Design a protein around this ligand. Sequence first.
Ligand SMILES: *[C@@H]1O[C@H](CO[C@@H]2O[C@@H](C)[C@@H](O)[C@@H](O)[C@@H]2O)[C@@H](O)[C@H](O)[C@H]1NC(C)=O
Length: 67
Amino acid sequence: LYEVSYRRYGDEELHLCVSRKHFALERGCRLRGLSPGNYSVRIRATSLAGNGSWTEPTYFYVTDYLD
Ligand SMILES: *[C@@H]1O[C@H](CO[C@@H]2O[C@@H](C)[C@@H](O)[C@@H](O)[C@@H]2O)[C@@H](O)[C@H](O)[C@H]1NC(C)=O
């Protein structure tokens, strides 16, 4: 599996578990219907041995369709 830890600046952390089947199907992850803003993502692969280091933060901006 993988864990996706996203957070829109100021808010609290949101999460998502992406399983193998889920990952191979979706070609990664897909985040559906987030309120607008600049989000910060870290990703962490969990293998048979343990939880391996979080990917440095990436930023993604969901459009405001107003402002
Ligand atoms: C999204 O946010 C990135 C990181 O923001 C940085 O840290 C915060 C706490 C503020 O100090 C901010 O001014 C810093 O830039 C930005 O570097 C990035 O450009 C932003 N992304 C978009 C799409 O606007």
